[PDB]
């Protein structure tokens, strides 16, 4: 009976920018499907890169290469800054 989403993690980051505003549950599902799509897209892309360089392991360099291969330029620059924002902030903690 337990089924999965990201709607609370949608919800925090909704409240992390616009804490006042609400959102439709339809839109909640929309963002759930949206993050599912972009997650699966970038993961499939990076695993294809992993087969290309024949590297069975994967690192964050693969993910950075993946979003550079997927995103437009300002989006990709913002994304590589956002990814490199918290990697060793996680790791050295």
């Amino acid at each position: 009976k337990r089924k999965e989403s990201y709607a609370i993690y949608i919800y925090k980051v909704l409240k992390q920018v616009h804490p006042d505003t609400g959102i439709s549950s339809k839109a909640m599902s929309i963002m759930n499907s949206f993050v599912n799509d972009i997650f699966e897209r970038i993961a499939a892309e990076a695993s294809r890169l992993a087969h290309y360089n024949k590297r069975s392991t994967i690192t964050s360099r693969e993910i950075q290469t993946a979003v550079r291969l997927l995103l437009p330029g300002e989006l990709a620059k913002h994304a590589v800054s956002e990814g490199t924002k918290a990697v060793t902030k996680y790791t050295s903690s």
Binding site: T59, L75, E82
Partner: peptide, 23 residues
């Protein structure tokens, strides 16, 4: 998808997802 999953790679990924979601 990949053979040997890196530790910091999803840490990169979900950070990117969080950015674009907020964006």
């Amino acid at each position: 998808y990949a053979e040997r999953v890196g530790a910091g790679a999803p840490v990169y990924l979900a950070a990117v997802m969080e950015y674009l979601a907020a964006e």
